[PDB]
């Protein structure tokens, strides 16, 4: 056993967070790094590919979607998912 | 005066990373929430426009481009100027 003074109540980018100023300076800078270049490397796409007014309709979509927010909210917790994993691979 | 004793040899991405974990834990966790929402948002945006082979081509494009990857260094410099903004600005 043990004593149980959170299951309820969570919250996905609160651990995030955690893990990336708890983890080895090394794992997390080289995580955020990951994301930084992946980040310039999308936004370099829509430039080339000259969606970038296409993007901001998109983003600006958003507000009034509602299938789509909840979308975007999956896709943070899968990028967490992957971020955790590679420091934890690392 | 005072001793001269780094304007040579520079990296933009160390500075980042020493700002990200020495400015305030409540600002730099808004920041990087930031960020990891934006991802999301071109991520999911990609998909909905079905660019994901043209991104995966496109990133893919780049090992042999030159101009290109160039072009994604100064983005992630602009990235991390307005990151740093962002913390001196709240």
Chains 1, 2 share one sequence.
Do not use: C
Not at 32 to 45: G, H, P, Q, V
Not at 52 to 58: G, I, L, V, W
């Amino acid at each position: 056993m043990r004593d149980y003074s959170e299951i309820f109540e969570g919250n996905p980018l609160d651990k995030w967070n955690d893990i990336i100023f708890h983890a080895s300076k090394k794992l997390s800078k080289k995580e955020l790094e990951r994301l930084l270049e992946l980040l310039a490397l999308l936004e370099t796409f829509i430039e080339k590919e000259d969606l970038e007014e296409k993007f901001e309709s998109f983003a600006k979509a958003l507000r009034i979607d509602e299938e789509l927010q909840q979308k975007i909210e999956s896709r943070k917790t899968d990028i967490v998912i992957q971020s955790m994993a590679n420091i934890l691979s690392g």
